[PDB]
Structure formats: C-alpha cells, structure tokens
Design brief:
The chain contains 10 helices and 5 strands, in the order ααββαααβββααααα. By secondary structure, the protein is an alpha+beta fold. It has a single domain, classed as Retinoid X Receptor, CATH 1.10.565. Bound molecules: ligand PNU. It is classed as transcription.
C-alpha cells in the first residue's frame, strides 16, 4: 500500500498543481494573433495547426494557416505561439517554486532544473487538455486543431497520442512532472545527489501508486510504459530546443522569458 511519506508527497504535488495550473486558461489574454538554412527552417511545417477562438459572447474566430511557399507568411504564427509558451512556462515556474523539495534546493540549481525541464512539463500540462478523437488541444476558449491520421511520424504527436492512450490520473500526470523536473543529469546541476535521491523517491511513489490503484491487466508494465515515455520526452525536448533555436537564429520571436529559459 502507500505510505504516509508517499501520501504526503503526492499531496504536495497535487496541491502545487491545483494552485498553479489554469486548466481553462482564464488568465491567458492580450496575446498576439496572426495578422540556404531556410531550407530547413521549414521546421515550421511540422508545428502547424489551425486555431479557434470562442467568445465569451458567442462569437467564433478561426485561423487556417498558409502553405510553405515562396518564403514568408509561415512566421505568421510565431508570435502567438510564443505568447502561449510564455503563459505555460510561467505556470510551470510557479509550479516548481511552490514545492518544498524544490524551494529547498539552492537557487543556482533551481535555475538549472527549470531550464532542463520547462518544455517537458509544458508538453505534459498539455497532454491533459489534448483530445485525441478530434486531434485538438482544448485550451479554454482557444483551440489548436491538428490540420493522414497516420502521420505520427512527428515525434511530438506520436508522443501525445501514446500518452493519452494510457489514461493516466491527475496523480500520475503530476508525479511524471516531478520526475522530470528533478533530473540529476541536467546541465549545471550542483546538488546532483540530493536531486537524484528526490527523483528516486518520486519514481518509487509512482510505482507504488500504480500497483496500489490499477490491478487490471490493461495496467501491466504501466510504470515502465510511463518511464519510457519520459526518456522519450527528453529526446523530443532536445530535438525542439534545436529546432527552435534555428528559427530564432533567422526569425527572432522568443519572448524574454523564453530567452532566459534557453539562455539567450
Ligand atoms: C507553444 C508551443 S509551439 C512553439 N512554436 C514556436 N515557434 C516556438 C515555441 Cl517556444 N513554441 C506548443 C504549443 C502547444 C499546444 C499544444 O501542445 C503544444 C506544444 N507546444
């Protein structure tokens, strides 16, 4: 069964998540909206989605993006998306700051862990508003709807659908976020021991929490189907840091906060 320590660890996680996650994005506003190596900088074709705003008043605005052609007109969705990253990243920074195990680390190590994990916890805070029947991320009054339902050739997508299929609980979707924020192997971490011991506690609690609350055959090898997911999320996260730095190197759009995160 679960111990008192584990129960208190999940409760601090769940608490921090409640307090710092706006699942309806009420406080997301005043954000922008669409009015050589380039070769590759057509990295934007992979992250292309149609966007929908409802008002409230009953209105609907819908944006359908263009087609890679000529050159520009594809950046037409780099300012708003950056606004969304910034809204997200701040929720993720508040999440970390309000966990005692995190506030206890030295400042320089908090900054290391945030820069390693911000993406990963976003993409997780995002799987839970993902709708895999319609392929869309329901962000409150905002929708980002995916434009062959077999092009999960896109890592990110192939990872959103897989994750979704697991039907994790809020306690899961939370512990996976601890496990990923506390990675000892992140550039610039000093207290590599403490952090490794912390991760190790978060894992064993996830594993107990599953063997305690999921006896069904569908849930077998789950804890591991989950750990491998995280290992994968680390890779997608590298591939996109890189992709994102390319776009930025030729068409600067990162907010200050994203500059801090990526050390620009
Ligand atoms: C906002 C980013 S895309 C993005 N595009 C850029 N050009 C730069 C940056 Cl920094 N981010 C995003 C949005 C959603 C919505 C659902 O899942 C998501 C995962 N990531």
């Amino acid at each position: 069964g679960l111990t008192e320590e584990q129960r208190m660890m999940i409760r601090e996680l769940m608490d921090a998540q409640m307090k710092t996650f706006d699942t309806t994005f009420s406080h997301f506003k005043n954000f922008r909206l669409p009015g050589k190596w380039s070769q590759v900088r057509k990295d934007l074709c992979s992250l292309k989605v149609s966007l929908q705003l409802r008002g409230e008043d009953g209105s609907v605005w819908n944006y359908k993006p263009p087609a890679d052609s000529g050159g520009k007109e594809i950046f037409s969705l780099l300012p708003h998306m950056a606004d969304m990253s910034t809204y997200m990243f701040k929720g993720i920074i508040s999440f970390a700051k309000v966990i005692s195990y995190f506030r206890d680390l030295p400042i320089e190590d908090q900054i290391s862990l945030l820069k390693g994990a911000a993406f990963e916890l976003c993409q997780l805070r995002f799987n839970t508003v993902f709708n895999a029947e319609t392929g869309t991320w329901e962000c409150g009054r905002l929708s980002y709807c995916l434009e062959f339902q077999q092009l999960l050739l896109e890592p990110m997508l192939k990872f959103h659908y897989m994750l979704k299929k697991l039907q994790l609980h809020e306690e899961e979707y939370v512990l996976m976020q601890a496990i990923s924020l506390f990675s000892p192997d992140r550039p610039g971490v000093l207290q590599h021991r403490v952090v490794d011991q912390l991760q190790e506690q978060f894992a064993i609690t996830l594993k107990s929490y599953i063997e305690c609350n999921r006896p069904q055959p569908a849930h077998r090898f789950l804890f591991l189907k989950i750990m491998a997911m995280l290992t994968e999320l680390r890779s997608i996260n590298a591939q996109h840091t890189q992709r994102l730095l390319r776009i930025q190197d030729i068409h600067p759009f990162a907010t200050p906060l994203m500059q801090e995160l990526f050390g620009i």
